[PDB]
Symmetry: D3
């Protein structure tokens, strides 16, 4: 390997300068299979990587794992192997009443509820997306007729207390986080997830382009349990959007 974690060589990438970066390794084969000539490159720890081709151009798909720490590894190592553009795709829970299940969120910038962003820029630095990547994502979403919200996302180093989930072992939330979600709701924040503050801050502060889309699968203000077809249909739609954005940035 040319890098410490990913198990990849420069030649494995065949010149790729753009990576789609889901958190879940299981989505890597899915996205790559939407593209031409998908081939599996490597799988180690949370990092599963495939290569494919889009409009005759090599593209990478690599999973980040959950959270800023493993994200910052994947971005750092892909950057050493020539990746310059990074497009995160996921599914998410909305926290505003006007967003519906099936809608699409494009993130302009994130609230930094994480640790890793601080290892690249102090807190006053904005966790902002690349304007070209944001534009390509909104254009792609509107091109397939998605209902699309564009705005702020809160990025948390935990799934449970930092998103004020109380159905947990302890059933309590530390003082600093208790009531925080209602603050973020009043401030127009669309959703929570767990990798964009790191992704956006580290890319923006190092001349790398990054952006983020997500399919809404639950609305925590009007919460319904999703069935599989809905999770699949929402996942597919965000995957289609992200590939189409990638076409526009190649």
């Amino acid at each position: 390997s040319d890098v410490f974690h990913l198990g990849l060589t420069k030649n494995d990438l065949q010149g790729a300068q753009l990576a789609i970066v889901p958190g879940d390794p299981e989505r890597v084969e899915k996205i790559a299979a939407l593209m031409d000539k998908p081939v599996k490159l490597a799988s180690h720890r949370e990092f599963t990587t495939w290569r494919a081709e889009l409009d005759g151009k090599p593209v990478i798909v690599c999973s980040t794992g959950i959270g800023g720490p493993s994200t910052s590894i994947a971005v750092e190592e892909l950057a050493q192997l020539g990746i310059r553009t990074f497009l995160r795709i996921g599914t998410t829970g909305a926290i505003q009443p006007h967003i519906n299940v099936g809608d699409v969120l494009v993130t302009t910038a994130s609230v930094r509820l994480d640790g890793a962003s601080l290892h690249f820029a102090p807190l006053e630095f904005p966790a902002v997306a690349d304007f070209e990547c944001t534009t390509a994502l909104v254009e792609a979403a509107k091109s397939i007729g998605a209902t699309t919200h564009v705005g702020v996302t809160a990025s948390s180093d935990t799934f449970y207390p930092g998103q004020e989930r109380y159905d947990t072992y302890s059933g309590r939330v530390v003082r600093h986080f208790k009531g925080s979600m209602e603050e973020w709701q009043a401030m127009g924040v669309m959703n929570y997830e767990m990798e964009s503050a790191t992704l956006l801050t580290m890319c923006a502060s190092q001349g790398l382009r990054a952006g983020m889309v997500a399919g809404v699968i639950v609305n925590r203000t009007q919460q319904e349990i999703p069935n599989a077809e809905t999770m699949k249909q929402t996942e597919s739609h965000a995957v289609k959007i992200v590939v189409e954005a990638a076409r526009r940035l190649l």
Copy 2:
């Protein structure tokens, strides 16, 4: 009057929902004059307000004064008077080598080197521009052929120490600010100015739309005294840009 500071009543605005917000009271008339039916409404403190008409629609132009405090009063009072979108326009000094004088900077989000933004949202929240506004400003730049850079601006509560100026009374900078400029330039920041971290935080956190454009009059990494002619011309080009963006946002 209907507000504590600006000396304006609601009917003065005639239904206006967009305001162009320079810092300098002097620039107010310069902007009004591009549009139809310019009328001075009020001059109180740092706040000089004219109204004008663009494609048959009332637009406001209202100066903020320098700094987040006076910006916050102007935004809040204009919001009480029906303004939902706010476009800042300045002239500025670049801090990157590749930016040139007479280039145009559209800001996607700002480093929060201010105090007033904290009065709307904790430090982790990003001082992010509205996507529609930022798009309209990039497309408006392209519509007069400007050379445009899209990226992060550092927003400082001081002109002197916070922007690491040493030709001062004391000729010193406090430890926290000594050497900050090099860190911001490493992280790709384009320029400093003194109102945008306030303006973008308070608007993104309350569902008002905001955006910012500036014209470059000096490049601190290759610093020349600016020509009287260049400054006027770059000012006028930035002025046109922000009016044309207004036009696309009505």
Copy 3:
């Protein structure tokens, strides 16, 4: 001009080493007109300057605008032009029940609810007034029989949320500021305003003398609407006090 903002030359000051610094430009002519041979020097942005003479000595009156940012400009530039002593005068809202409308507040030091003070000294540094200027102000107030409180003032980068005003567009206050006024009341804080934390910290940390007086025009614990005569009578009384303090510091 010899300075970037104020539009002043060294010779304009005729040797003045003391400036009275109200926030409102409209008060500049008023104060200068209490003195001998008042002449208008310049007016640009929030900075209106007049020169006069007191006991045959030149004095400056210059407005700061609202907030620490424009304040720090005015102080910095007047310091480059030879001002060493700075006496802020305003009118204010009391936040304690024992203070009455018409009373006078002299500030010993301020709670730093601002951004600009931090560009001169870290937060643990006290925003303290000059002992000679505080003494001259208390002596002057007692000399005309004022009822005078001497103590702490909270200095905020906003007029609205940082002074927990709720009659606003959003009608809400960010978590950090919600309930803060009742903390400041329990701690004996007399009032809020918006320039002294910057003024005091930047002067105290640079060998410059500064102090602050204010006339009480509303008591927010027993709030009455003032009529014009009361605002005039209160303003006049604080103006008389500040000039008389200036006599004692010349």
Copy 4:
């Protein structure tokens, strides 16, 4: 499954109350295999879970992925599934001259260079190991004659800047982290790793028991490329230690 991420049900665990928690999914089977009746339970995301049996008692081995976020999800979900004690085992780089490769480090508490710990307790709370766990790990080290150092570990949300690595894409470290390594070495810290400040804070703050052991594979103060053979052997020695401690904690 009974939890959002791990894909496990309660009955899967068969009454297990202790979990051994490596970062790397690959190490899971290596640990399981020391014990009786190894059975792979699940592989999802970074979380690979086996069960095994030690002295007739069900034990879990479940990988956390890299970093506090994925560690927090694994700990919370395993706690919902009856796990009350959690032992981490890694391999690591020393940062003290007197530590040698193949030595063993038992951590008493960790420097909190992470974000997820903050989601359980404010920064002042110590990221401290459970005394029973730490004792069992020291005595377990002594029971195979290991050379053991007992002390503080620095726990970083990044592998690269937070551990002051400069052989990177950018080759720079942000100001706050530049020169931190020398300060930690002055203060006697032994090593860096990427999960323990999360793991120990969240467990000490909720009455779960946690502890950590690692084997030293590199000494950054006298840095040698590690031998394939040494690494396997030190890994196996750390693995044995954490199983033997488990044995004393059942």
Copy 5:
């Protein structure tokens, strides 16, 4: 004197490398008198020092006064005179319902509610005890049949507001501290006292060994007034434990 405060020479210590450090000077003679050949060395300010012998080895007893500031003096000066191991003993109030009057607390690490610890290590550094000293203390306690809790202690720079005592002059607690005790209770914290965050952080970050035991004299969750015999009997028992730990560390 060889030191600025303690009034001690190197020869006064006769080679002692271990000090027992109570806060109260009155306890110095008490502890020393449990040992052989106790002699009074000096008394200045809060620093009372006696020397004795244990298993034919010289030992020091020196009082710290209350709080991290005077503690950091006593530790610093005893360190210059050859002390390497420091064993704090006190009596305390429990804040958990399961701890009884007469029980013994051994502190693994402390919540840093103090100022002085920060003059030795930033807040993310754990205020952790020496493993050998913690072990010797637990072994000693169990050796005389004590009921012993081992875990976290909150160390506060005040007796009153930082331990949320309300029977005071003002009867109020600053916002930051109001409700903090119920946070510390939920997090398993055993008790409050006022010197260990400083003691532990400063020793751990400088290669010095430290530990802490306390006898429970009141339980603030089920609060009873103690009589003298109980305070004596509890004090004696902690003194016996600390001397016996000192025997094991000599």
Copy 6:
């Protein structure tokens, strides 16, 4: 006794409402002796209390020990016992070139380098002296012809690292404190001491009056070993000053 620490009852004080508060128990009698009817009341821990009589009025003199923690206990307990004004007196080291040994320093406010002040008010609140007290101390200095400097003092929770002393066990200073002394001297600070940020914050935030005077025994910028005679004489001059101020504040 009526309080937890000081061993005093209310009637002991005979109606006293002012306390003079040295750090050192030894100085207590030295101060008492200037006044009429000196009587030792109590000695417990660092707290030595005498009463005396000045112009027929009971005054208390009570030592605080070193540091904000023990100062906070003394102030709170004396406040429970009717003390409403508190004057500190020390000897100190200057950190400015123009100050001379045997000069007198009256403190207007303090840099908050302590932890206990935070237990009364957040960091932004100023550690400011009471105006009546400070005036009485300046006029009292003038009444014996002392050379007086009026200004800011840095108040440190440590004697060694926080005051940037390097002739220590470790001979090092943590990063945050390394080079702080030069910043304080730039900002005009006069001296360091170890109780005033506590004393002034807790009193200004609860409506008690406080003030501080000190005599200069060493000038760290031109450092000489102090003469036994000079120190006694400067101590006595500071002692007289604080008694004479007491006299003007009764």
